Design a protein around this ligand. Structure first.
Ligand code: HEM
Ligand code: TP5
Length: 291
């Protein structure tokens, strides 16, 4: 299966910077959401989940087709709560109807990361909506109650190695688990709408206890009020993951650079970019624009 990026007709960097800006301004305006966490984290999770259906073996799933807009994928149990991010983006799409759904969902994630003071994430346009019958079945996103070997094997399907996996998981510094969405409850650090390397510092420095939550699932809890999923905690149980966790806990810039690469790759998996395509766009933040 081949998906060739096709630039939305006549559009260039400035058009996409305008969509960025709309998203970024709404992120600012709608600050109350989720006990004043705001929509940044859920937009990052949305961009990951629309990308994380990809299968390298046959190029099914992936961000290209924008298939999250269809009921089967929208109602994936793994996607519970992301309707909030979709609803956030609806007025943006209404204002910019020319952008594809896949470009919008992925640009949402990029915008959120940058506006939360994360790394710059280069982003490429040209995802094209595909029909309802291209929507991947439920069950391609990962379970949270598993161990390091599960995580490693899972991410091979997405063509991600150990470093890419550990880098990507640093996003779990953002937002929180919600018991009603996933059967897990709690945040991963104190600054959960600012993008930092706190996930790794918390993994290493907190005193974690294995407890049951009110949904009868096990999770790791600290007296600080933080939590880790079993899959999060597996990153310090496996000796190879642990080395990389320590590396990112001790080098903010290295984490930023490695996250940026892995996140762009995640968002671009499955897509063929013509040699004549535009170079990746690097959007200015509102702050950089004086906006
Ligand atoms: C082994 C891989 C992964 C597992 C099992 C997993 C699991 C989870 C679960 C259970 C939640 C809570 C959802 C809720 O209750 O609302 C969640 C949230 C989150 N995930 Fe992951 N995830 C994984 C990887 C990733 C990756 C690769 C990213 C993106 C780079 C990511 C970004 C986030 C973000 C930002 C949230 C917070 C959402 C919010 O606050 O609304 N996750 N994840
Ligand atoms: N480890 C955490 N608190 C977490 C995991 C997914 S979103 C937040």
């Amino acid at each position: 299966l081949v998906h060739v990026a096709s630039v939305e007709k006549g559009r260039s960097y400035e058009d996409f910077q305008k969509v960025y800006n709309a998203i970024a301004l709404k992120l600012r305006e709608d600050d109350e959401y989720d006990n004043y966490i705001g929509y940044g984290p859920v937009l990052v999770r949305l961009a990951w989940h629309i990308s994380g259906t990809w299968d390298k073996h046959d190029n099914t799933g992936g961000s290209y087709g924008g298939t999250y807009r269809f009921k089967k994928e929208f109602n994936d149990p793994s996607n519970a709560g992301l309707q909030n991010g979709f609803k956030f983006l609806e007025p943006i799409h209404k204002e910019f109807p020319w952008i594809s759904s896949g470009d919008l969902f992925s640009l949402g994630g990029v915008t959120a990361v940058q506006e939360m003071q994360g790394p710059k994430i280069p982003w490429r346009c040209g995802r094209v909506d595909t029909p309802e019958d291209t929507t991947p079945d439920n069950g391609r996103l990962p379970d949270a109650d598993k161990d390091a070997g599960y995580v490693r094997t899972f991410f091979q399907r997405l063509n991600m190695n150990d470093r890419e996996v550990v880098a990507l998981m640093g996003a779990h510094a953002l937002g929180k688990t919600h018991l009603k969405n996933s059967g897990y409850e709690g945040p991963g650090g104190a600054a959960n709408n600012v993008f930092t390397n706190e996930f790794y510092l918390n993994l290493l420095n907190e005193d974690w206890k294995l407890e049951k939550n009110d949904a009868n699932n096990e999770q790791w809890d600290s007296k600080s009020g933080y939590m880790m999923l079993p899959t999060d905690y597996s990153l310090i149980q496996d000796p190879k993951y642990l080395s990389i966790v320590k590396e990112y806990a001790n080098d903010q810039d290295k984490f930023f650079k490695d996250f940026s690469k892995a996140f762009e790759k995640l968002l671009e998996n499955g897509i063929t970019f013509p040699k004549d395509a535009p170079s990746p766009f690097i959007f200015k933040t509102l702050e950089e624009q004086g906006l």
